[PDB]
Amino acid sequence: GDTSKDDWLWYKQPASQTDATATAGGNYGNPDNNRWQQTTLPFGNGKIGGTVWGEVSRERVTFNEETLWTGGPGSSTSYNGGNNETKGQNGATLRALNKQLANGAETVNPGNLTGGENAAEQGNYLNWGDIYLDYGFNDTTVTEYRRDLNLSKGKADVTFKHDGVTYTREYFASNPDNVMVARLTASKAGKLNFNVSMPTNTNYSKTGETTTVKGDTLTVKGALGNNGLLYNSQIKVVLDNGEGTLSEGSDGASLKVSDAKAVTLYIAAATDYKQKYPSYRTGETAAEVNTRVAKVVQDAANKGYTAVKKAHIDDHSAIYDRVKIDLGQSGHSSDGAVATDALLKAYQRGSATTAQKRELETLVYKYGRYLTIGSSRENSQLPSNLQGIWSVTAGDNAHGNTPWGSDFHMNVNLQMNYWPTYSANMGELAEPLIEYVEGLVKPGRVTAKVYAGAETTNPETTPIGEGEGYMAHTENTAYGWTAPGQSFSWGWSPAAVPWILQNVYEAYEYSGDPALLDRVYALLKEESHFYVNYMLHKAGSSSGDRLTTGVAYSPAQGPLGTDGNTYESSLVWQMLNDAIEAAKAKGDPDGLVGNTTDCSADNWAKNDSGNFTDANANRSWSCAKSLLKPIEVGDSGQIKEWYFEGALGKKKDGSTISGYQADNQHRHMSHLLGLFPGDLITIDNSEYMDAAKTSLRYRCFKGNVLQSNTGWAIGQRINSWARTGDGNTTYQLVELQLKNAMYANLFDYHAPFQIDGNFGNTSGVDEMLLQSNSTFTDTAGKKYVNYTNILPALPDAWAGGSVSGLVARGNFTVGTTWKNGKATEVRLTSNKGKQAAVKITAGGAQNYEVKNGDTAVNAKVVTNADGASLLVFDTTAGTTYTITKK
Ligand SMILES: [Ca+2]
Ligand SMILES: [Ca+2]
């Protein structure tokens, strides 16, 4: 085909010869594993993944399947989600601690709020192994070598000339046909000779593994030692025209292909995992999995390469091509095009041209969308983990050979994985996250009982929404590991659930979809019930006059075990906000919205049995929300991180806060979640926004110099800065992520490789060009909720450009063209007919007018007390409105 217009990451040498000189990080002491993370090119179908090395002779595709997880039922005889009954005492331990805080304690020792001690029960995500395609060349001398990742077509390509013959390789993983394809060619008949093997990683425990050949198919199968999970992979080799010979390798164990010209390999893998509490198994036998995997490769071969490839590209491109961004970038087809590793190095050196700078920025942005398609499909069994689905490291136990188990880290990281999912028009890719959080409900009720005394009768059978609450913490797995971890500071964080419910609720916010409303309403209802009934209390003297969440830590500074904090109260505020919105949208069938009549923190008074002593008092969602008072501006003009805080880093009396990083540059900004991702601190509130900008500047600058960071920290700061409207600072953060936190394969790093920052980048660029989360209040006091904000934080660096296919809440598809730093055209497609309300930050919307083609729309200009303006107008589903300067 014509690929000149496609987006490529491309390299002029194999992975083995690609620069892997950036910081390796923990677990990457093996030069070979470090080389994997910095140089290989990922692809996937949401379920299986490969990372292509592009080696000339011993070619290698590191292989993953999303469900290959140790831990869980079968890892012990008593697996119970890590919950420690002796520590939790059915809520008694937490209750006693909160009473101390209520009676005036500033801090308590939260040391016994722990669990999850058994690393075998926790487990971790495993690298499955490798596909090795050994051409058995005498040397690796080549010319005209290239390897690429075609982001537009979802496939990896390798080409080179060796001893008069041109060898090509193409790799993709089809979602529609559930199968990995390797298309391999030589330019001369009989010159394609290779050995096919697929060894499982040797660093995890396996029982009864066998490798059998039954040309045309190689099968590896066994069960995991740690938990008995059955696994099965197969490679079917189809000689393209039955030309060439298929034999068995001398080792076992491999398939040899001789004297061929071209072949297609069909690769499949599965386990008997099911996301289903409490057994987490399909109930299949090994033979039954073997048969299932066999049907995948056979079906694909019956379809054939042309049809499978066509179906793959149609499917991949349908999602990939929804968004287009032009900031003036060069690309792989440009005259004087630069390979992607050389591009990164030029960007780091300061010698990249404007076009090349825009190419790197724009490629990293696109890669975040690409990586979502590869790791998180609407039919994936699990959401993307700390590494999407791609890993090379393996070991049996949690906190072992793989950094943080490549797990589901739900106190910023899993959240970040789903920051760009809706705004960058990949909404259905959020489905496995929604299903994952749904999946936490049953096991989470066990935790909620043990640690907070919220008992759901028969947690297994009680529908989501009808139980007493579900609790989960930071480290999560495939197996309902909802217990807190073994040390409080990093292990305990029940507001992780509220937080991930933002990602979930946004699936409804951006779509208006009725079936999603029911699902998000059920999750929000039970979690809001949980907080109102079991987690909120009237604060003691240290935290002023308010309900707080009680025993808390602000990751990861200050005192352990304070009386609530801004981080948690901001999250609980948002959750109640969204639960109320969801209930209103349903006609508040359960009568839970209530009001603020006779509403007081005293209404939460409990006896020693945990029962309310004023049982019939108002504890409705509206009342509880109103009592949080999450944002308090402190004596330094900052957002307080603690309710006992005065000036920054100090208590009200001027003494210093212990555990506060006194240089003011603590890496986390847990108290700013109301600015991003939430709706608590917005451009529409200058008091709060000015204070949030003050907090951000203290955290992010040393002197007047903006500081670099990596991984999730830089991703969070880009998005947080975007919400302020400071496009220039936001952009300088983007530059700093590209310079200091991207490997040659554009994997984001911490170090080591962590995918969160890849997805965070894509989201941050979205939030520069379009915001949709805030609420505008006009001079008449009318609210415009989730108004469309065009170019809210456009950097001066991007003087002109266009973007199309972004999504705004209310379900509008948005395109924008700008020149000389100001919008020239907005194209707003109303997908659901919701009333439009449009701010034009780069232009002033009062200077614009609205048309439906030739029809002039009678848009009204409304303005707020601060003198900013919205264009408001009714819309019809399916219609595009063009907004242009008068
Ligand atoms: Ca997945
Ligand atoms: Ca919202």
Would you write up a description of this structure?
This protein is an alpha+beta fold and 886 residues long. The chain folds into three domains: 1-18 and 40-72 and 124-321, Beta-galactosidase, Chain A, domain 5, CATH 2.70.98; 19-39 and 73-123 and 331-769, Glycosyltransferase, CATH 1.50.10; 322-330 and 770-886, Golgi alpha-mannosidase II (Immunoglobulin-like, Sandwich). Helix 16 (686-700) packs antiparallel against helix 17. The structure holds calcium ion (CA) (2 copies).
Q: What key attributes describe this structure?
A:
Glycosyltransferase; Immunoglobulin-like; 9-stranded antiparallel β-sheet; 7-stranded antiparallel β-sheet; Beta-galactosidase, Chain A, domain 5; 3 domains; 28% helix; binds calcium ion; 886 residues; hydrolase; alpha+beta; 38 strands
Number of domains: 3
Spatial separation of the terminal alpha carbons: 44 Å
CATH class of the largest domain: Mainly Alpha
Are any ligands bound, and if so which? Answer: calcium ion
What sort of overall outline do the alpha carbons produce when their principal axes are compared? globular
Question: Could you give a short account of the major beta sheet?
Answer: 9 strands, antiparallel
- Structural class determined from secondary elements: alpha+beta
- Radius of gyration over all CA atoms, rounded: 28 Å
Number of helices: 19
CATH topology of the largest domain: Glycosyltransferase
CATH architectural arrangement of the largest domain: Alpha/alpha barrel
- Strand adjacency order, main sheet: 1-6-7-8-9-16-13-12-11
User: Beta fraction of the residues?
Assistant: 15-25%
Number of strands: 38
**Relative helix content:** 25-40%
PDB class: hydrolase
Keywords: fucosidase, glycoside hydrolase, hydrolase
Assembly: monomeric
Entry title: Crystal structure of 1,2-a-L-fucosidase from Bifidobacterium bifidum in complex with substrate
